[PDB]
Symmetry: D2
């Protein structure tokens, strides 16, 4: 019997590469998505063509609300329903947009940015652990969390809370054999809405290669942390940033 993984926000970009690499390694996968239904169904098709009955999709909004605990329990339940087990949780889904201090309401911005980046990872970790081999959680963090983007306080607060969660859950779940770690990209696949001039600005900042990470280079670090070569690693966050966070202003 093959192990199974949940990857949140897996229809596109980095989450998609993570799901694909997990699948190539021998994992059965839940592809969680919010809006990207066609891309999700498309990916599960591709993976199932390769090895039948090894991928399903699971739709959920991960914005904070009184029903978020239920939705997170459902993502984990969907893994047990399809595969009879759940060995790996990857917390990848994330809202990312500015929220300056000086059309969405501030209530909604807090709900989305803190919900996706922090509260949903927390609830998913709870549900994952309560449902419980080589078990582990990998949280997608941010190498720039101490040198934050300007006017991104809510986003940056969420990513900080995710560091806190990584550490707290590593400590608490250790006696259950569940390891909890992070991968912190600096600049990888750039925002779809970002202009080409900004993208090149950022690329020119990276010491190693003057370019962004492929989604695949981020996934590689995720694969290492879930693997048997990382059996003593818990509470660790691996920067995959080509040296970006080392460059002064």
């Amino acid at each position: 019997e093959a192990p199974a993984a949940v990857v949140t926000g897996a229809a596109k970009r980095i989450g998609r590469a993570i799901a694909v690499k997990l699948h190539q390694t021998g994992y059965r996968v839940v592809i969680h998505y919010h809006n990207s239904a066609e891309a999700a169904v498309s990916l599960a098709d591709e993976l199932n063509k390769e090895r039948s009955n090894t991928a399903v999709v699971c739709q959920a909004d991960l914005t904070n609300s009184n029903v978020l605990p239920a939705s997170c329990e459902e993502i984990i339940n969907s893994c047990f329903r399809a595969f009879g087990r759940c060995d790996v949780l990857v917390n990848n889904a994330s809202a990312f947009y500015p929220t300056p201090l000086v059309g969405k309401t501030v209530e909604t911005q807090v709900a989305e940015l803190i919900g996706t980046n922090a509260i949903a990872p927390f609830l998913l970790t709870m549900s994952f652990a309560q449902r419980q081999s080589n078990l582990s959680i990998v949280n997608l963090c941010d190498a720039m969390v101490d040198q934050p983007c300007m006017a991104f306080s809510l986003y940056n607060m969420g990513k900080h809370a995710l560091v806190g969660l990584t550490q707290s859950a590593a400590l608490e779940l250790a006696p259950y054999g569940i390891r909890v770690n992070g991968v912190a990209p600096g600049v990888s696949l750039l925002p779809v809405a970002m202009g080409e001039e900004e993208k090149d600005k950022w690329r020119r900042k990276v010491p190693l290669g003057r370019r962004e990470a492929s989604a695949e280079q981020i996934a590689d670090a995720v694969i290492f942390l879930v693997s048997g070569s990382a059996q003593y690693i818990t509470g660790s966050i691996i920067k995959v940033d080509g040296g970006l966070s080392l460059v002064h202003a």
Copy 2:
């Protein structure tokens, strides 16, 4: 005239000591409280006896909800209505209790722990800056990287607060508003706690084998708001007697 400060959760313990030292420094103060009305009023009366019309109280719940932004705007508004200005914001109010991974619902725990420790501070910061030696001091935690077992939501809240301190220091520096943190290790121990359990913590502290008084915590806050810290922003001053340096 005299500057003015808002201190959240100022009725008791550390928040009380901060409001008192700010007032002794020459600040007029808004004493925010949630449940401790009698303590908050008794403080206001004590301070107004010192100097008339220099202390007011302001009640609010700082739990996350749809009304929290309004409550936070109103707390800032009260300082302006009382004193005509708002020079200092101290984010001190905090819920703190275990939330194990394995009689409140989890969504209430999220609302209270993340609300008080992180979201309320962010909203208050927003309202404070929009209304503008201006500065904000956030009460953090020296043990954020070596957290208490089964305190994930609290620990998440305090990490968020660090992120807030850094992000707001960056973004508010052009307006000349400094944003800093004070991080206690072990200070005034919970009210319930038996002396035998307080002693376990006190014995861990290298400097004196004793917890910080609320006054020692307030001293660092006073430093950070003063003219002696005018180039200090984005900084978190540990006040922990070396506790965070002690391995398991």
Copy 3:
């Protein structure tokens, strides 16, 4: 009786500013210097005409060598010889220049960069403690230690070591009632070798005021840490950098 302080490299710039503020606070001061004899004696003259018999000079090379332990022991001894006590040690003296990975021998550069920034503070800390109220040590650190200047590896290695000493000495000397803390400037008084244009480059990167810290502003944080207002503070490094360390590439 007035307390006594040793400040290393105190003939000019930040070290002078620290010695002056300690003096104005009521301390008697040992003005350590290496090459700046005229400036050191000039300073002591100014302080002594303020209050008679309150400042002395002390020459020492703080380069690493087999005699460095004797030299640091003697700097402390001179505070006791002059004032009968030594309450405060400020580790300020510092060599700062590039050492590219790809003039002085490399062994000389190691000796000067590591000696001044790390080994001497360590030896002085040993001597200060062995000779032993509000006793403390303040180490001048660097807010940019994790976002270092290009080609400054040895200088950066020395400032990181100084962080480890601050932490290790806070831990070990706490039972003796000696507190050990740091102040970490970002950009303060720029090097005299630096031209106005390069100075302005640095100035423009600082969020808080677009300007460097005055030497007085750095001295202020030192005076705080040595005061009774910081009686519970040990192993803390306070950045005084106007937000510089928070700014991304």
Copy 4:
């Protein structure tokens, strides 16, 4: 032709495990040693039995001295001499013993503890870079650098300097495509001299399984960092500590 790796202090324990795993992955290796000549040749013999002429030994003292630069240049040269290339440098050799603030002179302890943990890594880095594909350097760090052992200031100073070197060299050598990373054990193979009951005290503190890391679990992280799966990673230090560093006093 196979790539080639230099591993310092490779005759025993963790260095030996790193050398063995690199060799099993397909590297030719230089086994550096100081006093452990017999063990080093024994290791070389075992590896050469596996594949002829794929393992050589190299003797050097890594204590700071006037001759250290030439010694480090020779270690690097021995790899080029033996194998015609040098692809990987693992800075593992390390002196570790207490140096109380309040046998060997203190200046010897400085030379050993700072020389092995920091200055030799710096000089070897210089030589490795100067003599220059998937090139990288891995530095053996310490997960407990911020919660150090009581009375180990110089050791802790050297490990902190090694973090600064990891960062500084990652930044400066990125343009050359040389990556520079760290692996940070907590408790792995306990020192031979350590008492048995004292060893169990440490094991009982580790959240993940209340045991120490095997030397192989440390080596696993090294293998990852030098591999093609870590090609975007530089300036990163991976903790392999089973959560020990997350545990409060």
